Each structure stands twice: as C-alpha cells, then as structure tokens.
Scaffold this active site. Structure first.
Site, mmCIF file in Angstrom:
data_model
loop_
_atom_site.group_PDB
_atom_site.id
_atom_site.type_symbol
_atom_site.label_atom_id
_atom_site.label_comp_id
_atom_site.label_asym_id
_atom_site.label_seq_id
_atom_site.Cartn_x
_atom_site.Cartn_y
_atom_site.Cartn_z
ATOM 1 N N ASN A 110 4.734 -9.629 -0.514
ATOM 2 C CA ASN A 110 4.469 -10.526 -1.639
ATOM 3 C C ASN A 110 5.617 -11.501 -1.933
ATOM 4 O O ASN A 110 6.390 -11.846 -1.032
ATOM 5 C CB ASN A 110 4.015 -9.763 -2.889
ATOM 6 C CG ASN A 110 2.980 -10.527 -3.676
ATOM 7 O OD1 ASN A 110 3.322 -11.304 -4.560
ATOM 8 N ND2 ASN A 110 1.702 -10.349 -3.321
ATOM 9 N N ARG A 111 5.728 -11.951 -3.178
ATOM 10 C CA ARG A 111 6.516 -13.144 -3.470
ATOM 11 C C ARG A 111 7.865 -12.873 -4.113
ATOM 12 O O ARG A 111 8.004 -11.972 -4.945
ATOM 13 C CB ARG A 111 5.707 -14.097 -4.364
ATOM 14 C CG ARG A 111 4.457 -14.626 -3.699
ATOM 15 C CD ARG A 111 3.646 -15.545 -4.597
ATOM 16 N NE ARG A 111 2.600 -16.190 -3.798
ATOM 17 C CZ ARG A 111 1.430 -15.629 -3.515
ATOM 18 N NH1 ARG A 111 1.137 -14.426 -3.995
ATOM 19 N NH2 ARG A 111 0.547 -16.267 -2.753
ATOM 20 N N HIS A 124 5.955 -12.698 1.743
ATOM 21 C CA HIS A 124 5.731 -11.748 2.840
ATOM 22 C C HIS A 124 6.835 -11.766 3.892
ATOM 23 O O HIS A 124 6.577 -11.617 5.090
ATOM 24 C CB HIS A 124 4.364 -12.001 3.511
ATOM 25 C CG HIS A 124 3.183 -11.654 2.651
ATOM 26 N ND1 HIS A 124 3.235 -10.710 1.651
ATOM 27 C CD2 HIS A 124 1.911 -12.122 2.658
ATOM 28 C CE1 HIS A 124 2.051 -10.613 1.070
ATOM 29 N NE2 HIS A 124 1.225 -11.457 1.668
ATOM 30 N N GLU A 174 -3.257 -3.616 -1.092
ATOM 31 C CA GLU A 174 -1.923 -3.447 -0.528
ATOM 32 C C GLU A 174 -1.038 -2.665 -1.472
ATOM 33 O O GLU A 174 -0.684 -3.151 -2.552
ATOM 34 C CB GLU A 174 -1.282 -4.813 -0.265
ATOM 35 C CG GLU A 174 -2.221 -5.808 0.389
ATOM 36 C CD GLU A 174 -1.824 -7.238 0.102
ATOM 37 O OE1 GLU A 174 -0.619 -7.532 0.163
ATOM 38 O OE2 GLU A 174 -2.714 -8.060 -0.203
ATOM 39 N N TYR A 176 -7.518 -5.843 5.371
ATOM 40 C CA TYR A 176 -8.656 -6.142 4.504
ATOM 41 C C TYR A 176 -9.844 -5.354 5.042
ATOM 42 O O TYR A 176 -10.081 -5.320 6.268
ATOM 43 C CB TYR A 176 -9.100 -7.604 4.587
ATOM 44 C CG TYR A 176 -8.121 -8.724 4.297
ATOM 45 C CD1 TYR A 176 -7.023 -8.957 5.121
ATOM 46 C CD2 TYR A 176 -8.360 -9.613 3.252
ATOM 47 C CE1 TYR A 176 -6.165 -10.020 4.881
ATOM 48 C CE2 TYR A 176 -7.514 -10.676 3.009
ATOM 49 C CZ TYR A 176 -6.424 -10.875 3.828
ATOM 50 O OH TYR A 176 -5.585 -11.942 3.594
ATOM 51 N N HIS A 226 -1.402 -4.936 5.256
ATOM 52 C CA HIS A 226 -2.254 -5.959 4.663
ATOM 53 C C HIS A 226 -3.672 -5.915 5.250
ATOM 54 O O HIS A 226 -4.316 -6.947 5.412
ATOM 55 C CB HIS A 226 -1.610 -7.320 4.922
ATOM 56 C CG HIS A 226 -1.985 -8.382 3.934
ATOM 57 N ND1 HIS A 226 -3.284 -8.798 3.744
ATOM 58 C CD2 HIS A 226 -1.222 -9.142 3.111
ATOM 59 C CE1 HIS A 226 -3.311 -9.756 2.834
ATOM 60 N NE2 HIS A 226 -2.071 -9.988 2.436
ATOM 61 N N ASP A 270 -6.073 -11.844 -7.090
ATOM 62 C CA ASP A 270 -4.871 -11.867 -6.273
ATOM 63 C C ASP A 270 -3.778 -11.382 -7.206
ATOM 64 O O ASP A 270 -2.907 -12.150 -7.621
ATOM 65 C CB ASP A 270 -4.580 -13.280 -5.770
ATOM 66 C CG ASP A 270 -3.426 -13.322 -4.784
ATOM 67 O OD1 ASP A 270 -2.934 -12.237 -4.386
ATOM 68 O OD2 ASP A 270 -3.014 -14.443 -4.401
ATOM 69 N N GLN A 302 -1.644 -4.491 -4.793
ATOM 70 C CA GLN A 302 -2.137 -5.860 -4.840
ATOM 71 C C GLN A 302 -3.603 -5.847 -4.433
ATOM 72 O O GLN A 302 -3.946 -5.348 -3.369
ATOM 73 C CB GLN A 302 -1.352 -6.746 -3.865
ATOM 74 C CG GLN A 302 -1.594 -8.244 -4.043
ATOM 75 C CD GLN A 302 -0.811 -8.822 -5.200
ATOM 76 O OE1 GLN A 302 0.085 -8.166 -5.748
ATOM 77 N NE2 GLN A 302 -1.148 -10.048 -5.593
#
Length: 341
Positions: free
Chosen positions: A85-86, A111, A306, A182, A180, A240, A278
């Site tokens: 993430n950020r 990431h 995540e 999906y 990650h 998100d 997440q």
C-alpha cells in the site's frame, strides 16, 4: 485428505532473459490446485471445487508470463513489498533520517515502488507441502534502508493455502508484506464478484483522502456506514479501503473474513496475524485484459482481500508499528481456507 503433490516447470523468460519457474501445489479433487511463480511470488491460479464438487479456477490472472510482465499494474496474485500500500509523499522518517522513495502513485509511493517485490524474481526451493521463495532486498532498494532477508513460504494442506512471510534486516527499516490475490469464487471468468457475501471481523476502518492517504484521526467506526461488514452481506459497492481488524496484531492467525458465492457455493475463510485488511474491488479493470479463463476482466471481476498493516504507517506512529530492527524477526501468516455451503 491426500498428500500435497509439489512440482516445478519452466514458465518462460522475462524480457531481460531472467528465467521464471512455475510451482504447482496439488492436494487432489477434494482439495486445491495452486500455482505459484518465482516472478513476483505471483499466485497464478487457485482451483477449488464448487458445491457439486466441480473444480474451477478462481484467481484473477493471466495464462502467460508475458502478460504479467506487461501488465503488472493490477498486481494480480502478487507478493507485495517491501511496503504494501501507500506511503504519503513517497517519503518517511526513521530514526531521525528522511528516506526518499520513488513517487510511482502520483505524489505517493505504492506497493514498494516500480521495482517492488512483485516485479523481481525470487529463488525457490521445495519444502514439505509446498515452495519457499527467498530473496535479499539490498540496502537502498527502492529507497528503503537496510538489507532485508525475506522468505515467503507457500504450503497447501487439503483445502487450505497457507502463506508465511518471514524477514530479518541488517539495519532499521519498515516492512509490510502481503499477497495481492484477487478472487472470484464463481470463477475468474464469471463476471462481477460484487454479488459475493462478505463478513469482516472489523468494527472500524481507515477513512482516506482522494489519493488513498488516511486522514488524521483514529480508525473510524463502521456502524451506520457503507463499510459495515460485521454481518455477512453482498459487497455490492466499490471499495479500496483498509479495515482495522478486531484484536489488532495477533501472534497466531484467526479468521477475520468470510467470503461466499451463493451461485457456486464456494466459500473462503481468511485467517491472519495482521491487524488490517485492504478490501479492493478492482475498479480499474476496463475489459481490455483477457484473463486465464479467456474472458476479459471488467470492473469488480474479482476481490482482493490483502492482510496488512495500515496504509501510511511509516508516517503514522499511532498505527501498529511496521518498523523492523536488527536482531528482530518479522513474521506474518495468512491462511486461505476454501470450503462449500
């Protein structure tokens, strides 16, 4: 249960010529087949039976290596690091020192940067029930200080895929590793996953600004908001967002999420040691990429859950610490347990 079968075959070469292998973990028709790439630790496929016992491929991904190389922006199946993430402003302070990262997400770092863990090749070896990936991320890689010795072990037992991530460092650093993947429990080619029912053991979440940076303040209560998943319900909307899992950081994993597709009857119970999750509903997907089942992926084609520490933790001392120091051992464990209803 049947014994897990582990095998490895070449999966191709990256543009620079680096060889990539695909490891197959197979626990039989009543179990799973999971395939893992040495490139980016990518979980390429996950196959599990529906309520009639029929195997189907559930993970968003690609049939071929070239697609992953060319379209890494979705992070399909990826081992993400050094920091998932950020990090706001692509910068943080650690022990009085300012660390500068590459701004690969507007002004922010996302990431682990352009050359994050999801875009490098890992050494692999067979272990009981699966494969262990190993790579040292050297001091200064993508701006992060310290050489980080990382091992991520993927094992399969019956219907459960276990991923344990371990690390040590030779200098203080920050670490937040996740996978990650999906999933569409009705199959990756079945259309939207927004009809899936999700329950989260999370009474709070992390509200963010327009660029995904948490706003000042403690995690906000989910009650009365669109983020309330305390009782199982259709995902339905776009997300998100990080959820603050009840109980925070735990030494042993516990079930924190239950995802279910009423159509196929496939169910997932996600257990983790992590304090956060997440939820991302893949809204960037636009029908241009053809996935492994041969169907182009539209928005919400799959859901990423995540497990992680909270976004922007290196700039938020109020959040559970992501710092790792020499002599310490980072360990995170997440289990994806599939079944049917």
């Amino acid at each position: 249960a049947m014994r897990t079968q582990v095998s490895r075959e070449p999966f191709g070469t990256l543009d620079d010529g680096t060889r990539v292998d695909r490891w197959t973990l197979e626990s039989g028709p009543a179990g799973l087949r999971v395939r893992v790439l040495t490139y980016g630790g990518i979980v390429q496929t996950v196959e599990a039976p529906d309520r009639d016992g029929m195997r189907g491929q559930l993970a968003l991904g690609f049939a071929d290596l070239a697609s992953y190389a060319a379209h890494g922006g979705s992070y399909f199946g990826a081992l993400v690091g050094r920091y998932a993430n950020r990090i706001a402003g692509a910068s943080f302070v650690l022990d009085g020192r300012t660390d500068a990262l590459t701004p690969n997400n507007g002004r922010h770092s996302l990431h682990g940067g352009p050359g994050g863990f999801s875009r490098v090749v890992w050494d692999a070896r067979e272990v009981d029930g699966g494969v262990q990936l190993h790579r040292v991320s050297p001091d200064g890689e993508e701006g992060f200080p310290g050489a980080l010795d990382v091992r991520v072990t993927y094992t399969l037992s019956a219907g459960a895929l276990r991923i344990v991530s371990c690390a040590t460092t030779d200098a203080p650093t920050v670490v937040n590793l996740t996978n990650h993947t999906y999933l569409n429990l009705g199959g990756d080619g079945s259309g939207s996953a927004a009809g899936h029912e999700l329950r989260l053991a999370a009474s709070r979440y992390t509200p963010v600004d327009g660029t995904g940076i948490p706003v000042p303040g403690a995690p906000a209560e989910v009650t009365g908001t669109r983020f309330d998943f305390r009782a199982a319900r259709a995902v339905a909307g776009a997300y998100d967002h990080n959820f603050a899992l009840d109980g925070g950081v735990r030494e042993a994993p516990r079930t924190v999420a239950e995802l279910y597709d009423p159509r196929s009857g496939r169910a997932l119970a996600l257990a983790t040691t992590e304090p956060g999750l997440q939820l991302y509903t893949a809204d960037h997907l636009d029908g241009t990429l053809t996935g492994t089942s041969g169907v182009p992926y539209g928005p919400a084609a799959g859901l990423a859950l995540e497990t992680q520490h909270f976004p922007d933790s290196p700039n938020r001392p109020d959040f559970p610490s992501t710092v790792l120091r020499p002599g310490e051992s980072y360990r995170s464990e997440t289990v994806y347990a599939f079944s049917v209803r």
